[PDB]
Design a protein around this ligand. Sequence first.
Ligand SMILES: *[C@@H]1O[C@H](CO)[C@@H](O[C@@H]2O[C@H](CO)[C@@H](O)[C@H](O)[C@H]2NC(C)=O)[C@H](O)[C@H]1NC(C)=O
Ligand SMILES: *[C@@H]1O[C@H](CO)[C@@H](O[C@@H]2O[C@H](CO)[C@@H](O)[C@H](O)[C@H]2NC(C)=O)[C@H](O)[C@H]1NC(C)=O
Ligand SMILES: *[C@@H]1O[C@H](CO)[C@@H](O[C@@H]2O[C@H](CO)[C@@H](O)[C@H](O)[C@H]2NC(C)=O)[C@H](O)[C@H]1NC(C)=O
Ligand SMILES: *[C@@H]1O[C@H](CO)[C@@H](O[C@@H]2O[C@H](CO)[C@@H](O)[C@H](O)[C@H]2NC(C)=O)[C@H](O)[C@H]1NC(C)=O
Ligand SMILES: *[C@@H]1O[C@H](CO)[C@@H](O[C@@H]2O[C@H](CO)[C@@H](O)[C@H](O)[C@H]2NC(C)=O)[C@H](O)[C@H]1NC(C)=O
Ligand SMILES: *[C@@H]1O[C@H](CO)[C@@H](O[C@@H]2O[C@H](CO)[C@@H](O)[C@H](O)[C@H]2NC(C)=O)[C@H](O)[C@H]1NC(C)=O
Ligand SMILES: *[C@@H]1O[C@H](CO)[C@@H](O[C@@H]2O[C@H](CO)[C@@H](O)[C@H](O)[C@H]2NC(C)=O)[C@H](O)[C@H]1NC(C)=O
Ligand SMILES: *[C@@H]1O[C@H](CO)[C@@H](O[C@@H]2O[C@H](CO)[C@@H](O)[C@H](O)[C@H]2NC(C)=O)[C@H](O)[C@H]1NC(C)=O
Ligand SMILES: *[C@@H]1O[C@H](CO)[C@@H](O[C@@H]2O[C@H](CO)[C@@H](O)[C@H](O)[C@H]2NC(C)=O)[C@H](O)[C@H]1NC(C)=O
Ligand SMILES: *[C@@H]1O[C@H](CO)[C@@H](O[C@@H]2O[C@H](CO)[C@@H](O)[C@H](O)[C@H]2NC(C)=O)[C@H](O)[C@H]1NC(C)=O
Ligand SMILES: *[C@@H]1O[C@H](CO)[C@@H](O)[C@H](O)[C@H]1NC(C)=O
Lengths: 199, 432, 86
Amino acid sequence: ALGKLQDVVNHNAQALNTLVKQLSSKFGAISSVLNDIFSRLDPPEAEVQIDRLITGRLQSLQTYVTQQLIRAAEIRASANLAATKMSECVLGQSKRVDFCGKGYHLMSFPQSAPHGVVFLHVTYVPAQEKNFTTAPAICHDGKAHFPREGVFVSNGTHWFVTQRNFYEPQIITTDNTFVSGNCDVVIGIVNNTVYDPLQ
Amino acid sequence: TMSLGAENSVAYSNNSIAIPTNFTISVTTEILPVSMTKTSVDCTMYICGDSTECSNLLLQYGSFCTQLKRALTGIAVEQDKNTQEVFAQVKQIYKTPPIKYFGGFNFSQILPDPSKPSKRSPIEDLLFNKVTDLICAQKFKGLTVLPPLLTDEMIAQYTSALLAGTITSGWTFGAGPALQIPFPMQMAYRFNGIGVTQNVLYENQKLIANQFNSAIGKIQDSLSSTPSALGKLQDVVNHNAQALNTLVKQLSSKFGAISSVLNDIFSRLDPPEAEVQIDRLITGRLQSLQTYVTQQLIRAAEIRASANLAATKMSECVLGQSKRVDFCGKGYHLMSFPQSAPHGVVFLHVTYVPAQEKNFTTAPAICHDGKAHFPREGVFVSNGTHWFVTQRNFYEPQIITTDNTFVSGNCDVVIGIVNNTVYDPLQPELDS
Amino acid sequence: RAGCLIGAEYVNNSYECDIPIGAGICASYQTQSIIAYTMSLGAENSVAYSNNSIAIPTNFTISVTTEILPVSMTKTSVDCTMYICG
Ligand SMILES: *[C@@H]1O[C@H](CO)[C@@H](O[C@@H]2O[C@H](CO)[C@@H](O)[C@H](O)[C@H]2NC(C)=O)[C@H](O)[C@H]1NC(C)=O
Ligand SMILES: *[C@@H]1O[C@H](CO)[C@@H](O[C@@H]2O[C@H](CO)[C@@H](O)[C@H](O)[C@H]2NC(C)=O)[C@H](O)[C@H]1NC(C)=O
Ligand SMILES: *[C@@H]1O[C@H](CO)[C@@H](O[C@@H]2O[C@H](CO)[C@@H](O)[C@H](O)[C@H]2NC(C)=O)[C@H](O)[C@H]1NC(C)=O
Ligand SMILES: *[C@@H]1O[C@H](CO)[C@@H](O[C@@H]2O[C@H](CO)[C@@H](O)[C@H](O)[C@H]2NC(C)=O)[C@H](O)[C@H]1NC(C)=O
Ligand SMILES: *[C@@H]1O[C@H](CO)[C@@H](O[C@@H]2O[C@H](CO)[C@@H](O)[C@H](O)[C@H]2NC(C)=O)[C@H](O)[C@H]1NC(C)=O
Ligand SMILES: *[C@@H]1O[C@H](CO)[C@@H](O[C@@H]2O[C@H](CO)[C@@H](O)[C@H](O)[C@H]2NC(C)=O)[C@H](O)[C@H]1NC(C)=O
Ligand SMILES: *[C@@H]1O[C@H](CO)[C@@H](O[C@@H]2O[C@H](CO)[C@@H](O)[C@H](O)[C@H]2NC(C)=O)[C@H](O)[C@H]1NC(C)=O
Ligand SMILES: *[C@@H]1O[C@H](CO)[C@@H](O[C@@H]2O[C@H](CO)[C@@H](O)[C@H](O)[C@H]2NC(C)=O)[C@H](O)[C@H]1NC(C)=O
Ligand SMILES: *[C@@H]1O[C@H](CO)[C@@H](O[C@@H]2O[C@H](CO)[C@@H](O)[C@H](O)[C@H]2NC(C)=O)[C@H](O)[C@H]1NC(C)=O
Ligand SMILES: *[C@@H]1O[C@H](CO)[C@@H](O[C@@H]2O[C@H](CO)[C@@H](O)[C@H](O)[C@H]2NC(C)=O)[C@H](O)[C@H]1NC(C)=O
Ligand SMILES: *[C@@H]1O[C@H](CO)[C@@H](O)[C@H](O)[C@H]1NC(C)=O
């Protein structure tokens, strides 16, 4: 499960190893040891071997530094993402889809890991669905009624209004609907009774 | 001297407001690169070619080629990772019903075409024609191209499943199991999402469907006509070609030696200096390979950033409705549709744009019976002689009653409060 | 399309990818032998769309998932004189 973090560690180790292994290359010189070159050659002709060795080792170290800079940029991007997630999923509730887990985000908990962070996301998943017949508006007394905050459903014989994410049927009244226009504009309107709680 | 734009002055005052009276459905496009080419390099064939006597001297330079192979293999696997994390955002391969009636909305230009063997949409076919021997010549020098893991048909299948899910279920399939809903009711939910009431959609359904169909047709025509709309993808191709060409051009540079061909170097002069010139050529070619790998790494990092942005947009504009400004187009975001393009993705964003604004007088509160009244959900407007209350993004005046206002305090604190009547619906019923 | 594959039996079923060969071809160790197949994108599903039908959930589930992000890496220091000249 913790591969990503391990990958980071492994990468660094590899780099160091490679650098050490570059100390056994002679880069076209007669030997890989400076002491041998200086003790076997006279200085006017011993400069070319030392030049070759120095240039090769400088090139290796420069390559190491460049690879490190690129990796540091990537790690910085990851840490910026982690900081944004700490702000928006642990210190609040997020409406962005799939940002703080799969489902409707409820909350998050942070944990520390070697060189990293772990987020536990708690979300809400709907389940156990049923089929219903639905209409856009209800016709009553020549007027068109729309649900204030729900949706009209039918179980086969009678019409109710429910909230959209959890099934909870209720009687259609003038307190959970509003009127706009008449019954000859909306496509698919159905006839039913709207209950007045006052008369 | 370049001009920055056209000057405009807004008619600000203490009690003037502008309310839109119409709207427009807009569809716009966004192009994002996702992946780049996967290349492999053969050290021995590039540096020394066919001369095996050259291949012997390479062993005295350490592990310089294993490192380059490692870097290129990392880039290669990262490309497939990018594509997978952009396009494989669903678990079920959803299908669209055989009947293609969705309340008047057409959708035919973005749905797959069964006649063609590729099963691509009409718009997707046009994209794959705009974005487009040397390959064998480069192959004969140690430079090869690896095929991507997902084919074009599989990516088309992924986009088709995303489209079917979003057309039949709304945003429910991105948070769990897919729940079916009629399309006009979906778009009424989205109108609620942007702050407009449902009746506005249900009373203008034909006009909105016609506007959407016209916008999609215009997108098709504009893509067919303008050739420079896909330059974001083309650059990704071009930057590859140059990178290879330069590499080839480094195989004819002397690097200070007598000539570029090493066989003539071996056949002309004595080994004591042949070693020197061979070493010069080897160092030059190794340096060129290292440079190529370095800019390849930097380009891969940039492409990874672009692909992360594309995956976020797939999550937030296609699988949901976004309140972030300008993230899913210009306007108030309604929905989005994905299309696959060579090495990239195209998003068609459908947004709502207000139109035909009108001037009105306005007040913060209404004074009645020594009490201050504030609107519950809208704003108070005056057409000159009468006062109404309306919703903020669409002109629809209504009488001021106690059902669409609320009371707080008296008329001695609010600056700019006006006098009017608040109608009580209980008294007419009581007296009748 | 990636080349010539030797030592694997091609089967006509589809599974989730194990070892990517390329061009939609993956390989796995099953049965026991090594097989090559075309990867499956997912399970088939169809949604019952109609003029006036809606689906509404009656229950829910509380789900907890994990996300792992790297934050920092190792801090290294190099001495030129000892690495190059010893
Ligand atoms: C739809 O729901 C209504 C709920 O009111 C059901 O009507 C009730 O059914 C019960 C049977 O368990 C009766 O005891 C009640 O008297 C009924 N109410 C009324 C007002 O008559 C109705 O049966 C349901 N329809 C279906 C097909 O399940
Ligand atoms: C809902 O009720 C209205 C009237 O209450 C129905 O309208 C009638 O439709 C018939 C057609 O069969 C006409 O002959 C009548 O003149 C109409 N009446 C009025 C007052 O306009 C309407 O048909 C009903 N809805 C449905 C779906 O049947
Ligand atoms: C309404 O706007 C006008 C300007 O269009 C304001 O007029 C002057 O505003 C300054 C700012 O403090 C005052 O010192 C002046 O006394 C105002 N002029 C007059 C004739 O009153 C005006 O103040 C604004 N309304 C309110 C209530 O401040
Ligand atoms: C709102 O705008 C739409 C178009 O954007 C208007 O519908 C057009 O009306 C004119 C009449 O002047 C017709 O010629 C066009 O054919 C209509 N367009 C379409 C697409 O049908 C509509 O009238 C505007 N609303 C108001 C109240 O003016
Ligand atoms: C309601 O149900 C379906 C889904 O759109 C439609 O049924 C098909 O509609 C097309 C378009 O008119 C016809 O060509 C087909 O013959 C219909 N097939 C069947 C099996 O009904 C139906 O038309 C929709 N309602 C409306 C008003 O279009
Ligand atoms: C949906 O859009 C397609 C394409 O815009 C329409 O097909 C066109 O229909 C007209 C009239 O029949 C023809 O002149 C065009 O040649 C057709 N174009 C293509 C590409 O086939 C189609 O009529 C629209 N409506 C429906 C219900 O499919
Ligand atoms: C709302 O009222 C303002 C104020 O008069 C109008 O702005 C003026 O528009 C005319 C255009 O004929 C310009 O000549 C003036 O310079 C504008 N005045 C200012 C202060 O900018 C505005 O056009 C009106 N809007 C509507 C829809 O009627
Ligand atoms: C502002 O709106 C009010 C209410 O809509 C207008 O009053 C109506 O005007 C029409 C046309 O002049 C008459 O047919 C109605 O009888 C009026 N109703 C009432 C209750 O007076 C008013 O005319 C509009 N005023 C302006 C300046 O546009
Ligand atoms: C709204 O009505 C109240 C009461 O009718 C007004 O308050 C009066 O203001 C005049 C100023 O000309 C005073 O002479 C009266 O003594 C006030 N009466 C009371 C009971 O306070 C108020 O001015 C009106 N609103 C506006 C904007 O004029
Ligand atoms: C909603 O789902 C929960 C489980 O997530 C149901 O509770 C379980 O019901 C089964 C069957 O009766 C029992 O064996 C379990 O002990 C219950 N609890 C758990 C934690 O599983 C619950 O009954 C469902 N609600 C409805 C209305 O069916
Ligand atoms: C709704 O009915 C269809 C048949 O038209 C069925 O396939 C589907 O499973 C039903 N949905 C639910 C949630 O039972």
